[PDB]
Design a protein around this ligand. Structure first.
Ligand SMILES: O=c1ccn([C@@H]2O[C@H](COP(=O)(O)OP(=O)(O)O)[C@@H](O)[C@H]2O)c(=O)[nH]1
Ligand SMILES: O=c1ccn([C@@H]2O[C@H](COP(=O)(O)OP(=O)(O)O)[C@@H](O)[C@H]2O)c(=O)[nH]1
Ligand SMILES: O=c1ccn([C@@H]2O[C@H](COP(=O)(O)O)[C@@H](O)[C@H]2O)c(=O)[nH]1
Ligand SMILES: O=c1ccn([C@@H]2O[C@H](COP(=O)(O)O)[C@@H](O)[C@H]2O)c(=O)[nH]1
Lengths: 228, 228
């Protein structure tokens, strides 16, 4: 839908970032020239940042612009959502307004299943899904640590980290390893002063130019205008 | 919707069981003569059974047919669902068929909120709702114990306990006390041999005569035909 996975061998594969974007369970579609490049490059910076902090990620190296070399993992069938500020689907689950500052981070577990439209699950559903309580606890522990690292990093750059989605897999040693991507597609980012979205919500809710919004994030983090 | 709550004093109130039944977030409505009486009487038997087993319930005594004397509690805004067999909403959350025997009980937490249509929550939402992790853990621990007591009791009477909903409150000592009702309205009950519903699903999905189904449960448990 937004990425291709290309085999290399048993140990590694290629994650390719496409210009394609979707929303509303794949029902909204557009292409944005440069979006693959931006998301690829922002994922690299985030993976490298988190690695420095002791977070095991699938990130191995770059394979030219839009393609990353990543470790092969047994993927957990989860989307793991961390929420600091109330936005999107949390508005329908809690009677709190968009922009409400949570007293502590909220972690949500979603089962990756297209047929069931990615329903929310708890630790018990997880277990029936074959994911042990100890696996779940260390998945959440990692997500909360990632949260602290990303929110501090971004607050320096005048960016509020509202929420974001993570995915994980096990490597050959049975270690839990951070996977997929971290990009303006899979996070909400607000400008600290204006509270404007610099993320996929621009596309989701037609708030302006998606590529300008993504370029802003890139420029704020790197201090440079994008090469494409 | 199905019950009235009538004050007595600071310590206690009246729970009255009405003939009214609803389904599909209150959109389906009917009255069933005798349903209040059946649900009242079955709640009594269940509360008395669980009390014997060390479960603190709000049950104090009977006030004539359809009305129970119950303890006043600070109610948790939760519906706590325990699931042994796949049925109802769990079919949309897990790709398992109706009638699938779970490898262990599933506990689900729902936030009681009419505006939000009782959305599922996890421990983190609970906390933002003002419910501590320790409160949640002992709420679930009680629900799982209630489950074991009810499923064994009912298996003797040729009834499979598929799932059921519980509600809870704190008494003046800050003890967590089982509340609301336990009736064929708030449980799924299948016949052990035929797998037929003897519960509110009869009404929900027009499967036959609701009152016959409820009378069956009553007769199986008490060994007697209902006085009304
Ligand atoms: O479903 C709801 C209900 C309320 N609120 C919040 O809590 C306040 C409660 O006030 P009310 O529901 O009367 O709405 P208002 O009149 O403030 O718009 C609102 O301003 C909202 O910020 C919310 O976020 N979601
Ligand atoms: O959304 C789903 C998908 C599958 N299944 C179960 O897993 C089996 C998988 O087979 P399939 O999805 O091909 O359906 P079938 O062809 O068996 O009806 C089914 O029989 C169902 O019991 C389910 O319960 N829910
Ligand atoms: O399939 C999804 C669903 C959500 N999210 C991200 O997770 C957060 C919470 O999403 P929502 O549950 O509010 O839609 C947002 O940052 C959103 O972009 C994803 O990356 N992929
Ligand atoms: O508002 C509700 C919702 C569900 N249940 C009960 O909880 C179980 C699971 O319900 P569902 O989530 O499958 O609808 C069933 O026994 C159902 O009767 C209730 O008592 N009240």
């Amino acid at each position: 839908k937004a990425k291709k996975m290309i085999p290399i061998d048993d140990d590694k594969l290629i994650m390719e970032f496409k210009d394609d974007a979707t929303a509303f369970d794949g029902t909204k579609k557009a292409r944005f020239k440069g979006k693959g490049w931006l998301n690829a490059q922002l994922s690299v910076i985030f993976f490298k940042l988190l690695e420095e902090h002791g977070i095991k990620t699938h990130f191995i190296g770059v394979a030219g612009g839009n393609r990353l070399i990543v470790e092969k993992l047994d993927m957990y069938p989860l989307e793991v959502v961390v929420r600091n500020v109330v936005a999107g689907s949390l508005k329908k689950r809690l009677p709190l307004p968009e922009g409400y500052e949570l007293p502590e981070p909220i972690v949500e577990l979603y089962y990756k299943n297209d047929e069931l439209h990615d329903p929310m699950i708890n630790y018990y559903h997880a277990k029936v899904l074959g994911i042990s309580l100890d696996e779940i606890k260390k998945i959440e522990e990692i997500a909360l640590k990632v949260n602290e690292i990303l929110k501090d990093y971004l607050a320096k750059k005048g960016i509020i980290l509202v929420d974001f989605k993570l995915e994980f897999g096990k490597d050959k040693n049975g270690d839990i390893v951070l996977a997929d991507e971290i990009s303006p597609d899979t996070c909400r980012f607000w400008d600290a002063k204006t509270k404007r979205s610099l993320d996929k919500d621009v596309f989701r809710f037609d708030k302006g130019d998606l590529i300008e919004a993504y370029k802003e994030i890139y420029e704020r983090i790197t201090g440079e205008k994008p090469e494409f």
